[PDB]
């Protein structure tokens, strides 16, 4: 599974 709200954004 992937998080469409976190994964496509830049890693913190």
């Amino acid at each position: 599974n992937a998080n469409p709200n976190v994964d496509p954004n830049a890693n913190p």
Partner: antibody
Amino acid sequence: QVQLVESGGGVVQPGRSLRLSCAASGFTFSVYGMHWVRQAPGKGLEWVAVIWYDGSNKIYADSVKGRFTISRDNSKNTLYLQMDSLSAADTAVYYCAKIGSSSFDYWGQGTLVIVSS
Amino acid sequence: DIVMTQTPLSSPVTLGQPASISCRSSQSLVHSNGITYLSWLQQRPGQPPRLLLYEISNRFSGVPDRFSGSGTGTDFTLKISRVEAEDVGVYYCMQTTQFPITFGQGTRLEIKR
């Protein structure tokens, strides 16, 4: 003052191509993934594609796999969508959307692409 | 794909009266991190959609407190305590827990005056 401005809409013959743009301001474009959403006249919203913050990974809807290509130019803060092999089923108002607040927090104004002979 | 079912298609509500819009998902929208990734969108006539609620009940920037969110798991409800004139348009629910991002059909809110 977060504003998304699209451009590139018009009329196109069946089978031909068209490229859409999406200018992003008010936020750091390089650190947010982007989406493309479309809405047929009088119909609902349908997701099209997503692109990572750096373009490293890209996911497409099954109805546009093999024909649409999502891309971005972080040096211009612009999101692109190349539409090849267009069909009358692809006639819709196309939106770009920014990721934010665990949703699509900001949208463009929408641009209309019509496929007609 | 997660199927979003919105009911009804049209809601005739009187000015100042409360209104509620239901949204149902084919699966649980609770992610592996324990967060329900359901959002409510407002599309005024001739305008793009704007975000009203994210994660069921959290209000977005500049969203009036009359808009409310409830429901958890697979059933969700967007509530307006006082229907105002700016509230005309279609309302969409959206999931972002899976990557085939799916929307609802929409609920048109018609205002009686």
